[PDB]
Design a protein around this motif. Structure first.
Motif, PDB file in Angstrom:
ATOM      1  N   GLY A  89      14.316  71.677  90.716  1.00 45.41           N
ATOM      2  CA  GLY A  89      14.828  70.772  91.745  1.00 45.41           C
ATOM      3  C   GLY A  89      15.443  69.468  91.258  1.00 45.41           C
ATOM      4  N   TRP A  90      15.278  69.135  89.975  1.00 51.00           N
ATOM      5  CA  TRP A  90      15.582  67.772  89.484  1.00 51.00           C
ATOM      6  C   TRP A  90      17.068  67.430  89.466  1.00 51.00           C
ATOM      7  N   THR A  91      17.894  68.430  89.163  1.00 46.80           N
ATOM      8  CA  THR A  91      19.337  68.242  89.134  1.00 46.80           C
ATOM      9  C   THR A  91      19.859  67.852  90.494  1.00 46.80           C
ATOM     10  N   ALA A  92      19.436  68.613  91.498  1.00 44.91           N
ATOM     11  CA  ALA A  92      19.897  68.449  92.871  1.00 44.91           C
ATOM     12  C   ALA A  92      19.346  67.157  93.436  1.00 44.91           C
ATOM     13  N   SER A  96      15.803  75.104  94.619  1.00 46.73           N
ATOM     14  CA  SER A  96      16.253  75.562  93.333  1.00 46.73           C
ATOM     15  C   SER A  96      15.412  76.657  92.800  1.00 46.73           C
ATOM     16  N   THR A 141      20.577  75.022  94.360  1.00 41.47           N
ATOM     17  CA  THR A 141      21.085  75.355  93.028  1.00 41.47           C
ATOM     18  C   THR A 141      20.471  76.658  92.569  1.00 41.47           C
TER      19      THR A 141
HETATM   20 MG   LIG Z   1      18.000  71.678  90.941  1.00 43.39          MG
END
Ligand SMILES: [Mg+2]
Ligand SMILES: Nc1ncnc2c1ncn2[C@@H]1O[C@H](COP(=O)(O)O)[C@@H](O)[C@H]1O
Ligand SMILES: Nc1ncnc2c1ncn2[C@@H]1O[C@H](COP(=O)(O)O)[C@@H](O)[C@H]1O
Ligand SMILES: [Hg+2]
Ligand SMILES: [Hg+2]
Ligand SMILES: [Mg+2]
Lengths: 274, 274
Positions: free
Chosen positions: A18-21, A14, A74
């Motif tokens: 990175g947290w969303t993915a 990302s 992302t």
């Molecule tokens: Mg992410």
């Protein structure tokens, strides 16, 4: 020498955190919970935050090729996403823009084209909402609390969790304060009286919690029975069975009820303005 | 009478909790941060957890039609997803399976077909991991801590946050304990000495935190200067500027460093076995 060949790896990448993915990956992985239970299938995530230029991106993808690993990603910059699948193709590696679908669906429906800009960007960075600053004052409320000053807190709280020691209040209570609800915990224990104020407050914000005993120091059994006496006497309290359920599930239950009531409605649902 | 016409709405719908989609929606919404800043564009999320049968699903979609609203969704049952876009079409409403991409990418790469089963399901429900039970013991460690028993904690901790009062340690520290790291906070304040033990512990787990003053009681300025003296004397400590940065960003920074060091590596990244 080498700090990590086989054991199918998944690269998460990302331009931001990175947290969303990470999330969406983790959720997806539930679909293969059954083979993973014996380590028949077996996986490794790898998070690359702040991959916000061409040079890093290529180094990563190359590295991901060297490792033999799928690239979920992302990236807000459209050409960075173009590059990603291009250079994946060139190294002969799979990939998937996990978010673009969701961005574009929103973009058509609202009828505005994307920023095309990461959160990392110099421009439009660091202006934080009044939503995010309630969550702090919530997180504060919830941790900073004791046995000797419930009475006041019970009136100030948004959610209140009554239950036995062995239910998981502290994690649950913190998880909700993350979402922006001030939570107060009230342990139900044999020998101690509950505070008068527990009952003089709004009774629509109190939620019982309880363990199923199945899923000798079985005084434990007694303490549960005792609890249900209390819950009986207070029927307007939902009483959620938490054993087996994960905090985020149990939290959703509670919030569903709490909102259903908060805005009385034809269709029950949790809503945020933006 | 009615508890909610216009103001483009986004329906979030899941056979489980809604949290994954909620996230990915929220992340997407960054792409329209600029028009949203004036309320030029304006949106409302609506979460429907536990939409795990046909009847609810239709009621919802119908309702979403009545409301004039995009449907982002996450359903593990393939026919439920088929139904969703079918019945969306029939009501003439947009939609998007936010997760299927990511599920299928994983399914090919691992070479196993999905469970096709929600978390809600009776079958394969309630078997929780050794990962999730560390996060509890972390969450516990981090909240249950005082000024008068740091020394011991500093050795037991995985991450340690040194900084001024006005930096955001408590939220940050809790956010990391959610991820499964025991965090200890150490306030840097003029007048008090720091614990000897802060320096006798492993110095690769200590992270400075600091405010930029820009982004009279400006003793505040003094306290910052004082902090940097300390940080100077300890150069091996990263020193992160937190003002403007959100907890989850700052957390990613820290974890990146913490992992880069923890497993010394060619390519720096955060990895979990499954
Ligand atoms: Mg992410
Ligand atoms: N507030 C925001 N402004 C701009 N982009 C964002 C925002 N929040 C999330 N994103 C983008 O959406 C993706 C989210 O990934 P992450 O930041 O790792 O959770 C990244 O590509 C971010 O740059
Ligand atoms: N551990 C799991 N087992 C089965 N399905 C899961 C698991 N975790 C997430 N999911 C599914 O993936 C989606 C995640 O949405 P949510 O549960 O709202 O975050 C839902 O359709 C869930 O049923
Ligand atoms: Hg590709
Ligand atoms: Hg559709
Ligand atoms: Mg979901």
């Amino acid at each position: 020498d080498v700090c990590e060949a086989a054991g199918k790896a998944i690269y998460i990448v990302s331009d931001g955190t990175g947290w969303t993915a990470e999330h969406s990956v983790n959720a997806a992985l539930g679909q293969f919970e059954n083979c993973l239970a014996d380590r028949g299938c077996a996986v490794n995530t790898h998070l690359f935050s702040l991959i916000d230029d061409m040079d890093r991106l290529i180094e990563v993808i190359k590295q991901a090729a060297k490792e033999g690993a799928l690239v979920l990603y992302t990236l807000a910059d459209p050409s960075m996403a173009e590059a990603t699948k291009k250079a994946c193709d060139f190294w002969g590696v799979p990939c998937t823009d996990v978010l673009r679908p969701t961005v574009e669906a929103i973009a058509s429906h609202i009828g505005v084209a994307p920023s095309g800009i990461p959160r990392s960007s110099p421009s439009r960075n660091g202006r934080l909402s009044e939503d995010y600053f309630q969550r702090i004052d919530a997180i504060d409320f919830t941790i900073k609390q004791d046995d000797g000053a419930l009475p006041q807190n019970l009136y100030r709280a948004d959610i209140v969790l009554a239950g036995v020691s062995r239910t998981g209040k502290t994690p649950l209570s913190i998880y909700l304060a993350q979402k922006g609800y001030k939570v107060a915990n009230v342990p139900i224990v044999m020998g101690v009286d509950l505070p008068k104020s527990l009952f003089e407050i709004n009774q629509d914000k109190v939620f019982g919690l309880t363990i199923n005993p199945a899923i000798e120091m079985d005084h434990v059994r007694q303490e549960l029975v005792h609890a249900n006496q209390i819950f009986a006497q207070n029927p307007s309290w939902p009483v959620i069975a938490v054993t087996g359920k994960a905090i985020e599930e149990t939290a959703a239950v509670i919030l569903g009820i709490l909102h259903d009531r908060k805005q009385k409605c034809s269709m029950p649902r949790i809503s945020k303005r933006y």
